[PDB]
Amino acid sequence: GSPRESKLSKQEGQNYGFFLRIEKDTDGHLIRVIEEGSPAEKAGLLDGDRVLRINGVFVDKEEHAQVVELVRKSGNSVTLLVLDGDSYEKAVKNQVDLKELDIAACSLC
Asked: Can you give the residue range of the structural domain that contains 105?
């Protein structure tokens, strides 16, 4: 499956509505527990998605704290490039260069 670009917006007094996790023996910055009615929910985030980029910044190899800090530094809007859990785990298995993944697609019909 393709990565997706999710554009989240929130107000002061709100959160985006998900947890970012590192899990034992699991690769990637994991999105977990999408809160009902949240910006994350509205923006198409899914449990098990990995965050590849935050506002264009490649974060797959960054430490958890630095990924969370980039979210904080983004303020009340943030663009996430995410990849679903199955596609991410297949990509790592297949030695796909995650840095080259982009949403741009174009086919002639």
From this structure: 1-109
Question: Taking a C-beta distance cutoff of 8 angstroms, is the pair 24, 93 a contact?
Answer: no
- When divided into structural domains, the chain yields a total of 1
Residue 40, token pair as written in the block? 């994350």
With b for 16 or more beta-carbon neighbours within 10 A and e for fewer, the 4-24 pattern comes to bbbebebeeeeebbbeeeeee
Phi then psi dihedrals of residue 50, to 5 deg: -105, 140
CA 88 → CA 13, 77, 100, distances in Å? 33, 24, 13
Deposited experimental method: X-ray
Give one DSSP letter per residue of 35-94, joined into a string: PTTSHHHHTT--TTPEEEEETTEE-TTS-HHHHHHHHHHTTTEEEEEEE-HHHHHHHHHT
Paired tokens of 59: 């974060």
The CATH number given to whatever domain includes residue 33 is 2.30.42.10
